[PDB]
């Protein structure tokens, strides 16, 4: 094209400001002029006052962390059929993940809004709704025995 003028297009601005000048931000440097604004402050976020934070609010989050750790339990990834009818044929796990949602997300439970069309759709779980919804014409593939 041309080595010359191929540069940024109205916004590189790789021009940070320098607090050491004599006009603009200066002396005190990009604002300051007091103390405890001199080489690091406590937080703020959670900390300070030396008061109580708001570590005052009680941890309701119960049933939380025993010790060996988490409990290996079956997770169920959710997917509406309004994102499902996106295609047709025979929709089942794997067929997803490899596309759309899931990705080893484990159990596939369909459900949702929209209005899926007829096409036996395998899964692990459906909604009292999700079922009836495609009950109009679809599939009841399910569980496992192995």
């Amino acid at each position: 094209d041309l080595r010359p003028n191929p540069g940024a297009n109205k916004r590189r601005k790789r021009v940070g400001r320098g607090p050491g000048s004599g006009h603009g931000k200066t002396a005190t440097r990009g604002h300051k002029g007091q103390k405890s604004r001199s080489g690091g402050l406590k937080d703020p976020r959670r900390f300070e006052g030396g008061r109580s934070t708001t570590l005052m609010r009680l941890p309701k989050r119960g049933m939380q962390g025993q010790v060996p750790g988490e409990i290996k339990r079956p997770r169920y990834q959710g997917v509406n059929l309004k994102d499902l009818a996106r295609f047709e044929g025979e929709v089942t796990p794997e067929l997803l993940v490899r596309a759309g949602l899931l990705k080893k997300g484990y159990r596939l439970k369909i459900l949702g809004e929209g209005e899926a069309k007829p096409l036996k759709v395998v899964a692990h779980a459906f909604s009292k709704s999700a079922l009836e919804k495609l009950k109009a014409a679809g599939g009841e593939p399910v569980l496992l025995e192995a």
Partner: protein, 207 residues
């Protein structure tokens, strides 16, 4: 969308021509192109700017003066950065400069590359190469009747190392294997010239 290239006579058969969508003069984007160049010219940056910090220096830690009744200014070790001999404050530390420019862009960039050059008609798909056993002469001779007197810089790319040698030494030429095509060099040179084979792989890289 304007795409007629310039096939290069093999032997007796004339000069045909090919073509390819936005893969030719379409919507060139100056910025993106640049973006790709920065990235290219940064990643290649051999970052080795070292300077010794305060503790990095080679002095003792003794406290030069008693600190309180000398009139002299208060001081630490001769390593203090206000001590001449001292260590640099925010000197440069050896650091890397690369980052991962979006592939889908890294390519769309090579697109605009080849493109532009072709839209200005400086793109040329060659084929006929009478140059053998790497001989500067033979090559120069070729280019002559090839329509390249050495006025504009020429990025030569071919899977033929022998031709490679041929121009491997001409001041007005940048010889480059086909798999090495890159927006920089493309842009860097005034005229892109490549073997049909080459143009294919570049095409394989995106059809």
């Amino acid at each position: 969308m304007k795409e007629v290239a310039v096939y290069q006579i093999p032997v007796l058969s004339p000069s045909g021509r090919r073509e390819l969508a936005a893969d030719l003069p379409a919507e060139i984007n100056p910025h993106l192109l640049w973006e790709v160049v920065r990235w290219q010219l940064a990643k290649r940056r051999r970052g080795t700017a070292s300077t010794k910090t305060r503790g990095e220096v080679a002095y003792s830690g003794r406290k030069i003066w008693p600190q309180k009744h000398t009139g002299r200014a208060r001081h630490g070790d001769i390593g203090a950065p206000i001590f001449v001999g001292g260590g640099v404050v925010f000197g440069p530390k050896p650091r890397d400069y690369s980052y991962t420019l979006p592939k889908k862009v890294r390519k769309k960039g090579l697109a605009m590359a080849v493109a532009d050059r072709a839209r200005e008609g400086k793109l040329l798909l060659v084929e006929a190469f009478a140059g053998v056993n790497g001989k500067t002469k033979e090559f120069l001779a070729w280019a002559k009747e090839a329509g390249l007197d050495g006025s504009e810089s020429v990025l030569l790319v071919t899977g033929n190392e022998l031709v490679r040698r041929a121009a491997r030494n001409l001041p007005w030429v940048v010889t480059l294997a086909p798999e090495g095509l890159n927006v920089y060099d493309i842009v860097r040179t005034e005229r892109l010239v490549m073997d049909l084979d080459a143009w294919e792989v570049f095409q394989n890289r995106i059809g």
